[PDB]
Design a protein around this ligand. Sequence first.
Ligand SMILES: O=P(O)(O)O[C@H]1[C@H](OP(=O)(O)O)[C@@H](OP(=O)(O)O)[C@H](OP(=O)(O)O)[C@@H](OP(=O)(O)O)[C@H]1OP(=O)(O)O
Lengths: 38, 177, 56, 56, 56, 56
Amino acid sequence: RMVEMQKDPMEPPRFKINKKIPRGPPPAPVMHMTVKEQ
Amino acid sequence: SNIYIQEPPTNGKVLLKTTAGDIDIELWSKEAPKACRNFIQLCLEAYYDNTIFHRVVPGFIVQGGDPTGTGSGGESIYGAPFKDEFHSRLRFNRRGLVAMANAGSHDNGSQFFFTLGRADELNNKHTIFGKVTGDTVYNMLRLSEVDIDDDERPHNPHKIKSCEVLFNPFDDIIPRE
Amino acid sequence: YYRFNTGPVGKGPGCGFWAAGWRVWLFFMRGITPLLERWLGNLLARQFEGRHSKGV
Amino acid sequence: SYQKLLKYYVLNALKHRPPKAQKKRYLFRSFKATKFFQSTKLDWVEVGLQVCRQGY
Amino acid sequence: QKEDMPPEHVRKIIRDHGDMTNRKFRHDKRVYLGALKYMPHAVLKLLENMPMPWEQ
Amino acid sequence: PFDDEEPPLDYADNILDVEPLEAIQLELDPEEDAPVLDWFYDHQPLRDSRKYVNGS
Ligand SMILES: O=P(O)(O)O[C@H]1[C@H](OP(=O)(O)O)[C@@H](OP(=O)(O)O)[C@H](OP(=O)(O)O)[C@@H](OP(=O)(O)O)[C@H]1OP(=O)(O)O
């Protein structure tokens, strides 16, 4: 029998979220010079 | 134009006639009915007559109330050491306080002591049943002027010659014979 | 005070008749309450959750 | 002072939008229905003392 | 219904916890702090129920 | 009314025991003011009366 635990309404945010971790990394294929121009 | 001093109003008054002069004690019988009942009845019973002050610690306390004068004696009106009574409004911030000596909790005897100064370490330990009135204060302090011999005992200890109860807050006190 | 101290009664200290003043602070409190809930809420949340890192 | 009280009077009357939108949310009923709060009855004075201690 | 309790219960709780400086109390320190958010609410309800000068 | 270093009072230790000391009141005429006179200075005058008010 699952029961949801009662939360104390005057309880502050329990734990700290601020921590920051670098953005995660397949490329679709692209399918898309003269000397003088260079 | 305000200088505040907070303390609950007292009730009852008792006169102690000592070799050091008169001492007026205003009692709190609302806060400490047990020890003030004990004190009033023991005064009415002549139990404190010719009882010395056997312990003087310079600038700390002067102790008396033992009929035997040894300091380990004395008994209450209740046939046993009675309970301690404490209040946040009664503290030791000063000399001029009249409190109950004990060897521990609920140990209260007939022995009592006057505060020669501040004791913050006796808080929530000894019960405060009274205070000495300013006019008579110096006389209390003369109780503390002695040449002190071994084990905090004066060579010529001051005595309580008699007792007068000036105002008795209790209706029902019957002195024992 | 003007109306109260009308006749024999002088400029002296003793006039009780608060009801009015009392009202005023209650109106104040009615409004300020939600403000303080929101501000103190944030204060607590910063205290416990942490000042947000990103300044996003 | 009489002039200023009229100014408050009139401004309130001018300003008087209806609520304009309404919610019947209840706070003490939510708090009271939850086990962390209990209810009783005390001397007002006694509560006042309790609140000051709590705030301290 | 949340039947009300003996008044001495709340009296004693606060008196026990009077300063939540006791080593034993610990976890109230976090809980108590959390409430601060609703303290102004409490104040407003306190004040609006003052007793009037004809009531003892 | 009290010093900063003076801690707040336990209601139960001082206040609870003590009398309430007379309120302001007024000397209503037994004759002329009789209708009003029995309940005039009670807290919520006619709370228990199915004649005068709705009810609780
Ligand atoms: O007569 P009182 O009962 O002592 O009232 C005085 C006084 O009122 P009146 O002078 O009108 O009689 C002050 O007036 P002023 O001295 O400033 O002319 C007034 O001052 P305000 O004009 O700022 O109200 C002052 O209050 P305060 O002493 O803060 O200035 C207030 O007495 P309270 O201080 O008792 O209000």
